[PDB]
Amino acid sequence: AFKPPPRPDFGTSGRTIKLQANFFEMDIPKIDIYHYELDIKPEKCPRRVNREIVEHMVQHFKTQIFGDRKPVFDGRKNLYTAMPLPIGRDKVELEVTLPIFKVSIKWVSCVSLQALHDALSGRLPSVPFETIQALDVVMRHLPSMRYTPVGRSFFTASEGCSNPLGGGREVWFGFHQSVRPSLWKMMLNIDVSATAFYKAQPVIEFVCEVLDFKSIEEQQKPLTDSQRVKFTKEIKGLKVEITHKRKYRVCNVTRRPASHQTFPLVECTVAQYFKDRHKLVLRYPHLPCLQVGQEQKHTYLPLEVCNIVAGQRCIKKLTDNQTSTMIRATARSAPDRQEEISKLMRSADFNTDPYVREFGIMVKDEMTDVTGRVLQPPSILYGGRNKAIATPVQGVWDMRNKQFHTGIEIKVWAIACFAPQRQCTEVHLKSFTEQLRKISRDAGMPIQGQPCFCKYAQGADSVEPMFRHLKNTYAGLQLVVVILPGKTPVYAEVKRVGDTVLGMATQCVQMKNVQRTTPQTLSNLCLKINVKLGGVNNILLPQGRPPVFQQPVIFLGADVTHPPAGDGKKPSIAAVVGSMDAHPNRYCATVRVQQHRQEIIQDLAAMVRELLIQFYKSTRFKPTRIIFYRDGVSEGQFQQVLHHELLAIREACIKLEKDYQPGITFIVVQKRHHTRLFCTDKNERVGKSGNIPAGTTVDTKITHPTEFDFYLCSHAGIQGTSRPSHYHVLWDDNRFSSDELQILTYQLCHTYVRCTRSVSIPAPAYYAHLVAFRARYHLVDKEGRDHQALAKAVQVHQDTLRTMYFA
Template structure:
């Protein structure tokens, strides 16, 4: 972040610190130093944190999270952010996210105690990247001059993913997450999440999820998208036909529900990371880094790809450790008639818009965000899953009732719905 500033920074005026680490480990002097260093880095990044926190207390245990957060919301009007210091891996994290995201709609940023005791500019910059978007800011945008022609008309980008419970756990549901861009850059995203039957591979409620996000896009931009680009993660090649058949139809139905005859062009792309293909540079001058990886942006669409279908490999990130693994993209449907070069360029550019870092990542930002949203929903369900897993349900409680309870548990607060709470 040195020498870089956010495209749109948020002024943080009312904020608090809650320290769940023991006072003998994180001393008051450590908190003062952390606050001063965080303010210095955030000011340089264009996200000024004004003054001292309105509240700074030590706390112990999961049970104190909700009462403390409710007190903060009631006592400090317009509180924007709670910085939570944790001693390490602890159940407090899940409770902080449950209360902040689903109960009260307060932005929360968790920090490991070791990073408070010993601050580094890199760690503090990473915190600022997350905090700015959680508060509604924009970290970076694609330069309009280099964007492909698909941006000439209103376009919305979707990311879809499903996470499944661990093997051998037959009680917990699968979680489907869909995110969509909410501006023209595209930088800001909104999310919607559903629980569904255990290990179901298709997003069963996709029609209503897409409809919800299209309405939100229109409210934010006052435009109806004429083009839709979908990055679908978590699909194996054997599922392509079923996923495309059901989910493409679901997206079309969502559009028709909004307005008769509304049929934006849809480009549907499956993203795969789990494969055994590796790419190497023949010319030593092209090799990058200690592991002699291929340079970021390397694209292969001949030779090792399918002879008749539209697929390509793209290594969008710079490999820091070990051999880079390119992502494999399968274009399952393309109403927008994009050329291979346009689609590859668009996908590579979307890998640069991920808010958590200032460099390109291995998959497009929408797919990455869908993954984060689904995993965040797991934390929202921690208590529910524990209760149902321990057999504490009343006898006669049906599986449908359990799913409906879980569905309510993963719905985020309206205040969190308008920002990237999952960043």
């Protein structure tokens, strides 16, 4: 379970395409640089405050130490210099004042950039991490002070334009920046981005925006408890500033107006306090005060003397309208984004950055050219009379004149309509039934007759007794179609009951899609229905599959989904699916709740054991090979994850049978990186968005210098700029060639049963996502006693276990 396998070869399959990547070559000197350890007492202050401390510590202690040396700082404890500092080894206490801190500098090490060159070439097997870290600290030292750092990105108010969102928020533009080793050179990965920020405005104006006032004096009355509570929820936690210089965090909003609100000086009011001490009379005395600092003390500031501090990211969720405006502001086609990144890099002036130039680094201002190959799509085989073969074109095909490979005859089914009768009439339901049966017969999934049961219902409470009744009354019941009036808790209840309480197949459909049907929608609905009932929609043309299918092989997809920002004990959800036939088409699912924000799948061995057992029951084969697509592990966790999960896989094998030792291939799938690929030639641009065509593959130039990784953009780019999926092979007993693995991955992107399209990641990974999503629905408002309760929540019924209920 040690080091990732070396790249075995380069891919040769498919026609070439000229591409540009948002990677900008770096020239790094062949020079040793110097790494010093810093400790700033006390180390509780924000990273930025530390950065300032060091920043003018260097200014204040210029004479003795640095002497024209321009150090870079990571913001916490790491300092780097281009040539060695005068303090030969010895920790030195330094005294720094801020307009109070002791800073100790001690030598740590030498970082050789020559060793980095050696790693980029053949000579070193590994890329020296410390070196990359050093370069990264160098490159982001200045913009960490100039701009507002968010993660690996930087944001700023765009000078000359405003993009308000309302509610005191506006769009800030910026960019992601990262330093990456490559087959060719050190690369600077730069992408543009945008995010909502709080406006740097007076608090009075903030109040007006949040409470929807065109101006204050609507009214000159204290706010209603409603208004005050909304304002409270909006400003709580934000930083404000005064002029009397002072910055505070807002912990509350007083109930009383400033004229009435009092504190112990003897009881003294806030307004009067400002009159007496600060010679100020409140223009808006009827308004509340912000409570700032510790909520235990009693420090209360009037609204009209405070400003919202500049550069605070808006953490809180945006409204629907705010979001709409955000999208509208930041939407760019592929060529537009390409031009924006290029414009940004020409206007960046990285090479005049005094710290960059101090470390002798040069950055290229043009995107790297890279040659991709466009893989051929697999043929898709259908069934019926035709045995039709479909040929994807630009990552899309369709169901017209085709029947499912194996279509289910639906004989017994029901309809529960939770939409109101007056809006979703019996005529609507009838007409919808007619249409659905037409499309379904065309597809080889004949709904033989009318539903056996069709009643209206209201509220979540009616779900369980209705479903119990159905299961007890109609023998051979295959499906319940559930019509919903849009967003409702009923959906989650329908799933809790069907999936985990009764083990019944349900298909939900929104009221509006019953009222107005279209062939495309009903067709997609049929994809879902056929799968849920155990059917096989289509299969990869068998003779067109890579040689790996010549022996029994199981395809696993795995994902962990974590709770959103904020809520803190809500668990993470681990989901693993495995193929159950040779096509591969049918999948079974396993799911677990696990520790909050843990990425490592804790219970993997038990899950894989289950899947292996089910695979044997379905196919009567034991897999000689296990292909494991693992979604969403970042590089910094590669070793962590691979160590636990690979072993878990082995354990599942070992405990199942000895000496059962199938070859394992462990592939990390990453859809959330910042690598963008653009057509160099305009006539290669596909559709309105002008993206690279589906099947575009890149395994040279910008990829890893020694390891086995590649980009594959398997999908049609409909809108904006495509995200090409990245695949990183952490382990491979099966000794794949690049060609076979890339082609296999591509083909798996065509087995996804919910649409006749090639999807952005292989089917097993996608299914993993759907399973986790469904689990999250089983857990809504539910968050060993506790953990057992949550584990119970996501446990499907016995009859649901062997199904694709997640489709």
